[PDB]
Amino acid sequence: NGCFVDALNVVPHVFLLFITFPILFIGWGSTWLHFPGHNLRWILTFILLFVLVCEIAEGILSDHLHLYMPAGMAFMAAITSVVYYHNIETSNFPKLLIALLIYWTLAFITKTIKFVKFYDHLRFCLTGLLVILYGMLLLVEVNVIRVRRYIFFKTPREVKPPEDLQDLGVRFLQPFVNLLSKGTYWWMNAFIKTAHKKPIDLRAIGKLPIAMRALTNYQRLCVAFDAQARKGARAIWRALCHAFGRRLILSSTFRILADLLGFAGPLCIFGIVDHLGKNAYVLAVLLFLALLLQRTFLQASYYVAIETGINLRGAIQTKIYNKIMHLSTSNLSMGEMTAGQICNLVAIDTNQLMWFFFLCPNLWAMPVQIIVGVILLYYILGVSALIGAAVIILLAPVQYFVATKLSQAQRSTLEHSNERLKQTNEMLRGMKLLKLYAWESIFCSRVEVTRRKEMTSLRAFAVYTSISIFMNTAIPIAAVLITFVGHVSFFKESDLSPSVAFASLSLFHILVTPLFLLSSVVRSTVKALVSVQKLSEFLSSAEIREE
Amino acid sequence: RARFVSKKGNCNVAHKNIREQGRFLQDVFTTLVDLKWPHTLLIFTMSFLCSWLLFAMVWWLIAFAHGDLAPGEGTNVPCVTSIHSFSSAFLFSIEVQVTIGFGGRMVTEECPLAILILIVQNIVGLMINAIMLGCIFMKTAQAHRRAETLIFSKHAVITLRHGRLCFMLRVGDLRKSMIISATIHMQVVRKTTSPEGEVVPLHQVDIPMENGVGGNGIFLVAPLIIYHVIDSNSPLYDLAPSDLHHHQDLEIIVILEGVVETTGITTQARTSYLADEILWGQRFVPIVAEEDGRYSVDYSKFGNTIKVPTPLCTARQLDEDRSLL
Amino acid sequence: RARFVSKKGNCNVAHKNIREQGRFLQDVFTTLVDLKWPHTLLIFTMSFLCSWLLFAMVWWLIAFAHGDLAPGEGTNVPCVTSIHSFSSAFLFSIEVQVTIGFGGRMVTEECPLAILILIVQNIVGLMINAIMLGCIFMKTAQAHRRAETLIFSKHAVITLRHGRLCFMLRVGDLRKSMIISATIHMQVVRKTTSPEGEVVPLHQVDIPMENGVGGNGIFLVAPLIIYHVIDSNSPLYDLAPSDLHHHQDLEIIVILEGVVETTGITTQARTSYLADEILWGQRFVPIVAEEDGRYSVDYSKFGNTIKVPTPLCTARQLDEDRSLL
Amino acid sequence: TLECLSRSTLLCVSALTVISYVTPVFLVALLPLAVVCYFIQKYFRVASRDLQQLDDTTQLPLLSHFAETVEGLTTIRAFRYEARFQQKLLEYTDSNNIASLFLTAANRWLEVRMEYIGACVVLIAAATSISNSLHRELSAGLVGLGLT
C-alpha cells in the first residue's frame, strides 16, 4: 500500500499548514527572546530544506502525483515551522511550541511506518536522513519545554529578555537577531532604507553592544597580558592571539568550509559535462545551492575577521592611552617618545594591525585549500598528476626566496619613511622662521635625499613584485600545457573527455588565486611585525615612580 | 513642530519599547474585530477554507483506507456511497460542513469511524460558524464612523464677554440621529517645569467647560459655541497675545464623549488646536436664522469670522487692568 | 501579610458561609458565560450530543415499534425509508437535527407520529442552537483581556510639588485602541478605631484625584502620572515616613474604569500598593521625548526612578513646619 | 589594487562574452540582472559615502585628542584629572568603533546581495545551457566553456 503511506505522510504537513495560517495572518495583519537550540534548529531546518530538494529530485525521476507530494508538503511545512519560530522569537508563548511538538511527533510516526514497510522489501537513505533530522528537532523541542515552561511546574522563571542588545537605544544588532539573518544582514535593510530618507548622524546611529565596548576589550586584554607576564615583544603577540581566540578560530573554520565547497563546484561542472556527453538537472540545482552556500560562509568569515580586528584596534588604543599616562617626561624629551612619533604610532598601527588581522584568516586557509586541491586533482588527472605536482612543488621554494628578498627591502622602506615624517613635522611647525631668512633649500634637499632613499627601497620592492607576478602566471600556464599534452599523446592513451579538461582548468584557477594574493599579504605581514615591535618598544618606556 | 493628536482624531504619539507579553494576540477576537473590512473578510474566508480542506483531506484518506475508494462492484458497500476521487470527496466535505446536504453521496451505517468524523465535523463547523457570526456582529457596532460625522471649526477664537476674556469654539451634528449625554473634557498640554526643579515633557490639565450651576456635559441639536471664561485660577490665564502665534507650543484638545442612540455604544471625538491655529480678538457669524416657520442653519458661515474692536492684552495684565478698571 | 486585592487585579478576600439560595445557578447562562473556553466548549458539545442521542434513541424505538424495523419486503412502507439499525437511526437523527438533510432515508406520510417527533425535534434544535449562539457571542464581549493590557508602575513614589507633599503613580495604554471616559476611584484601607470605641477591620476611604476645576476622570493617550496633593483634610495626611516601610499596614488601591471603543463594554482595572511597596522622596524619569517629528515614549524607563534631595518628615509635621515656614 | 581591479574587470568581460557566445539566448536574461544590480549599487553608493564621511569626521577628533594629551602631559598629570581624560578617550574610541563597524557592515551587505546576484546568473546560465545546448542546439564543446 505505497500510495496509502504516501497519503498518511501528506496528512500531518496539511494539519500544520492549516493551523499556521490563522496565527500567521493575525501576526501579519522590540524585545527579542531566544531559546536554547535556536541555532541548532535553524541549521537542522536548512538540512531539511536540502533533503527535501533531494526528495523532489527522486519524485521527478520516478514519474503519479500522490507519490511525490510528501516532499512538496514537507517543504511548506518546514517553511511554516520557520514562520512559527520567527513568530515565537518575536513574542513568546508556551502554546505555539506545543503546536510545533504535536506535528513533529506525528511526522516521526509516519516516517517510521515508511521505514518499516521499506525494510520488509535511493529512497532508503533520504528517508533515513529525514527521520534523523525530525528526531533531533523533537529532542530540541523537548529541551525547550524542559528549560522554561511548556507544562513544567507553575512559573517559567523566564529569562527577562536580554538588555545587553535590546535595552536603551540600540541601533546596531548583529548579535541580537535570528540564526538565518546573521548571514545575510537582513536587519540592515531598514537602516539602508532609512539613510536615503534622512542623512545619517552620530545620534542617529546607536551605541555599542554589551560585548562590543572598548572597556571590556581593554579589560580582557590586560587580564591576558597579566597572565602572560606571570608565566617582551613576543609576549604581547601571544596575548593578542589568546584574547581574540574563539572568534578568530571560528572565522578560520568558516573559511575552510567555504573552501571545500568552492572546490566542490567544479566537480558538479565535471558531472554536467559528462551527462551532456552521454541525473543532470540535479547537478544544476546542487551546484546552485553549493555556490550560494560558499558565498554565505565566505562573507560571514570576512565579517567576523573584521569584528576581531576592530576590537583589537579599540583594545590596543586604550591600552597605549593608559600607558601614556605613566610615561615619564624624561622619555618625552628623547626622540623615542616624540609626540609626532606617538601619533604616528596610534594612526599607522591602528591601520597595519587591522589590515593584518583582516588578512590573517584568509591565509589560515591557504594550506588546507591547496592540499584539498591536489587531493582532488589526483582523481581527475590519474598518472598525469606528476607534471602538475612538480609544478606546484617547484613553485614554493623560489616563492619563499622571492618573499625574503621582498621583506628585506620593505623594512628599510619603513625606517626611511619614519624618519621622513619627523623631518616634515619639524619642517612645518617652523615654516615662519624657515621662510624668514630662507633656509628652504637645505631642508628641501634633505627631504629630497630621504625621498630618493625611500624610492630606492620602493623600486626594489616593485621589481620584486613584478617578478613575482611573472612567475605566478608563467608557471601555471606551462603546467596546464604540459599536463594536457602528456595525457593525450605522451603516455596515457585514454582520451581526455572534455569534462576532465574543464574541471582541471577550474580547479587550477582556484589554486592560482591564492598565490597572487600571498605576495600582497607579505606587505601587510612585515608591517604588522614592525608595528608590534614598535608598540612593544613603546610599552617598555620608563614608568612613573609611585610614592 | 510635533502635534499631540491629529485633527482627524487619530493619535499621533508613536509607542516604543513595548514589553509584549503576548496580550496583543491574547485578545484574539477583540483584536481582529478592530481590523478593517478586507482583512477581516480575508481571515474569515481563510478560516472557512482551512477547516473545509482539513476535513476534505481526512475524508479522502478514510475512504482510501477503507478500500471503498478502490472501484469495485460487490463484496462491499462504501462508507460514503458514490465516492470516486479527491474532488468528489471535497464536494462531500463542503456538502456536510456548511449544511447544504446534497445527498448524492450517502454516508452509511456500515462504518462507525465515518460516524465519528461526521459527529466532530459538524460540531466544529457549528462552533466556528457561531464565533464568525458573533464577531462580525460585534464589528458592525463600530460607530467610530459616527465619530467621523462630528465636526469642529478649523480654528478657535477668543473674545471679551461680560467684561472678562473668553474663548469660543464651535461644534455640531451632521445627521438627524442624536448623541445621548455628550460630555466635554477640555484639556491643555505644555512642557512644564515645577518650582522643585522637576521638568515634565507634557502636562495635561483640565480647563473647565462653563455651563449652568455645574455639569461636565452639554446638549447638541444645533451648532453650539462652547463657552469657557479664563480666570486668574485657570491654567491658561498667564499667556500673552503676541507670543502665541509663532513661538509658544500650546495644544488645546477637546474630547467630546457620548453614546449614539441606535447602537447604544459610547463614541467620542478628539481634536487639537495648536498655538499657530488659534487667533485673537474676533467673533463668529450667527448661523441660526429664523426661516419661514423654522430655524435654518447655514454651514457655509460655520468657519466664517468677523473683526471686533476688542482690546489686545495678556490675561494676567488684563486682570491687573480689571483691578484698575 | 495578607493583601486586599492582588496585583493582577483579581480579588483576594475568600468568602465564607454564603447562604446559597440557589441564585448561583439561577443565573443559568450568565453563570456559564463567565467560564473559561475549554469548559464552555465542553458544555456546548455536551448539550448538542445530549440532545442528538436523546432523539436518536426515541427514533430507533419508534421505528422498532412500528415494525418497520423488522426487515420485510412488501405489505408495509417504513415510516422512515431505508432504516436498518441503531447506527443508521443515529445518522438520521443527526441528519434532521443539525439541518444537513441528506435524504437517503426518507420520513414518509404514512405515520403521523413520526411527523410529531420531527416537528418537536426541529423546534427544540432551533431553540438550543439560538441560545448556544447568543451565549457564545455574549461571551466574545469578554473585554477583561483589555483590562489585562493596562499597566501600572510596580511601586509609587511621593514628592514635594508646589511647596506641598504629593504622591505620583504612573498609568498607561498598551494598544492603539482608546478607552472612553476612564475615571479614577482612588481608595485607602486601614484597620480603624473610632473615638466611640468602634474598631473596624478594614476601612475604605476615598482620596481625591486632583485634576482641573473638579472631575473624577482622566484622558489616557500617553503615560500620565496621576497627581494628588495630600492636605490636612486628607485621610492619609497623618502618617510618618519612617513607619511606613516595615510595620504599618496600609493598602492604597486604584480602580480605573472606562468603556473600550469597539465592543462598548465597560471594563476596569484594580491594583494595590502595600506599605512595603511604596517609597519616599524620589522622582520618575521623563518618558516622552521629542523625536524626529513626533513624540516617542520609551517604556524601558517606565519603572525607573531617580533620587531627589527633598526633606523627609511627616505630613502632619510638614504642615506644622509650613505653618512655621 | 589598481592591477587587481584591471584583472577582475577583464575577467568579467571575458566571462560575459563567452557565455553570450555559447548561448545567444542569454541576452534575454542579462538585462534584468543588470537593472537590479544597478539599482542596488545606486542605493549602496549614497549610504556608503555617508558612512565614509562620518568615519572621517569621527576619526579626526580622536587623533587631535591623542596629540594634545601627549604634548600637554604635565598639566593633565598635575591636576590629576586622569580619570576624566581616560573617560573622554573611551567615549571617542567607542564612537570611532561604531562608525567603522557600520561602514564594514554595509560593505558586507552589498557583497552578500552581489553574491546572490552571481548565484542567480550562474544558475540560469547553466540551466539554459543544459536545456538548449542539448535539446535544440546539440553542441558539446561550448558547455565546458560556459560553465567554467
Ligand SMILES: Nc1ncnc2c1ncn2[C@@H]1O[C@H](COP(=O)(O)OP(=O)(O)O)[C@@H](O)[C@H]1O
Ligand atoms: N458646509 C459644510 N457642511 C458640513 N461640514 C462642513 C461644511 N463646511 C466645513 N465643514 C467641515 O467642518 C469644519 C468647519 O470649518 P470652517 O470653520 O468652515 O473652515 P473652512 O470653511 O475653511 O473649512 C471644517 O473642518 C470642515 O471639515
Ligand SMILES: Nc1ncnc2c1ncn2[C@@H]1O[C@H](COP(=O)(O)OP(=O)(O)O)[C@@H](O)[C@H]1O
Ligand atoms: N517595556 C515595557 N513594555 C510594556 N510593559 C512593561 C514594560 N516594562 C514593564 N512593563 C509592565 O508595566 C509595569 C512597569 O513597571 P516598572 O516600573 O517598569 O518596573 P519593572 O521595570 O521592574 O517591571 C511592570 O509591572 C510590567 O508589568
